[PDB]
Write a protein that binds this ligand. Structure first.
Ligand SMILES: C#CCOc1ccccc1CCCCCC(=O)O
Ligand SMILES: *[C@@H]1O[C@H](CO)[C@@H](O)[C@H](O)[C@H]1NC(C)=O
Length: 343
């Protein structure tokens, strides 16, 4: 079990002003630290944040959080469930800022909600250093769905924070799961680009510095899309992305005749193309959503290699490897053409 710690700096808050926090399970002797960012969509104005507060309140407040959480998948300490990092120090950072981990805005008389995701990560890292993180050799910042996009938005800031704090030996890396989206045409029209554009203004959202300087003022929404922000990043980032992500299909209004068949096949081809120059990636041809904290995340394979093995091969590459690949992207063009896809 991972044990809850609310942030000692109580000015770093969830949406409703309650303290943010993290769940921790230490592993003495291990110098690996895994900080996992939870996902869960987002909200982009007062009205729809109010709706989220009614029925998704745990994603906006810590007042009802449980004292413990079971580590599952890559957060599991059992080697059978987690062949990759079962002996690592485990951190689960709840997503209670509804801002894709980009905000740096306090609740005040002008703001009904605080959007502090980017500051929450920084404060967790800061407080963890006093609990053993100072002795780390590797800090893997991982995350799923909105948490996976959050990895892309925050990994370089974490590396910069530790550098300026005097810990240049800690290697910061990223693992972005199901957070790699396309700003594509909808299958049936009425969208992420505008909701994200409105979100950033609403959250005072921040994006990585090099990407911000490329796209410049008003266009920072571009940096929420993996294939645009990833080439600007200096930290190593491993990208896990279903070719037919359910969240991608949802926003594309896809729920089979030729038009939809072509739309789906093109979506997979486009995703494949964006990963062509991502050297550490795992991208199966499945219709699914999230993987790395699922208990059976060991089951899926691309070209015969599981995701836990691909991540271990990535670790070895950061010391091509014979029989230890790190770039694993399915080429078949339809969901479940890969036989190991989840049922
Ligand atoms: C296309 C699309 C989805 O829109 C986004 C685009 C770019 C970055 C982030 C998002 C939202 C991520 C939500 C994922 C679902 C979840 O968090 O469970
Ligand atoms: C608490 O967090 C805020 C927001 O990041 C920061 O400005 C302030 O310096 C922090 N205070 C302490 C004592 O860490």
């Amino acid at each position: 079990d991972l044990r809850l710690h609310l942030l000692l700096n109580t000015s770093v808050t969830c949406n409703d002003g309650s303290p943010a926090g993290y769940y921790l399970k230490e592993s003495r002797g291990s110098r690996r630290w895994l900080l996992f960012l939870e996902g869960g969509w987002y909200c982009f104005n007062r009205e729809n944040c109010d709706s989220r507060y009614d029925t998704m309140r745990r994603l906006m407040s810590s007042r009802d959080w449980p004292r413990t959480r079971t580590g599952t998948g890559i957060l599991s300490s059992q080697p059978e469930e987690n062949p990759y990092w079962w002996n690592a120090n485990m951190v689960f950072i709840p997503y209670c800022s509804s801002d894709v981990w980009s905000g740096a805005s306090s609740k005040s008389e002008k703001n009904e909600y605080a959007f502090m995701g980017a500051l929450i990560i920084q404060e967790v890292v800061r407080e963890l250093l006093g609990r053993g993180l100072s002795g780390a050799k590797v800090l893997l910042l991982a995350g799923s769905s909105a948490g996976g996009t959050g990895v892309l938005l925050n990994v370089d800031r974490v590396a910069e924070q530790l550098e300026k704090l005097g810990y240049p030996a800690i290697q910061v890396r990223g693992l972005a799961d199901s957070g790699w989206f396309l700003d594509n045409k909808q299958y049936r029209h009425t969208a992420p680009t505008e909701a994200i554009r409105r979100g950033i203004r609403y959250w005072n959202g921040v994006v990585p510095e090099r990407c911000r300087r490329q796209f410049q003022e008003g266009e920072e929404w571009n940096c929420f899309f993996g294939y645009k922000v990833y080439p600007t990043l200096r930290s190593p980032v491993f990208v896990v992305q279903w070719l037919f992500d359910e969240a991608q299909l949802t926003v594309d209004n896809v729920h089979v005749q030729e038009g939809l068949r072509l739309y789906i096949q093109n979506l997979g081809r486009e995703l494949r193309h964006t990963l062509k120059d991502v050297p550490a990636s795992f991208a199966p041809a499945c219709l699914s959503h999230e993987i790395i904290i699922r208990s059976h995340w060991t089951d899926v394979q691309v070209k015969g290699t599981s995701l836990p093995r691909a991540l271990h091969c990535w670790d070895r590459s950061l010391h091509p490897l014979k029989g230890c690949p790190v770039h694993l992207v399915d080429s078949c063009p339809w969901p479940h053409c890969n036989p190991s896809c989840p049922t």
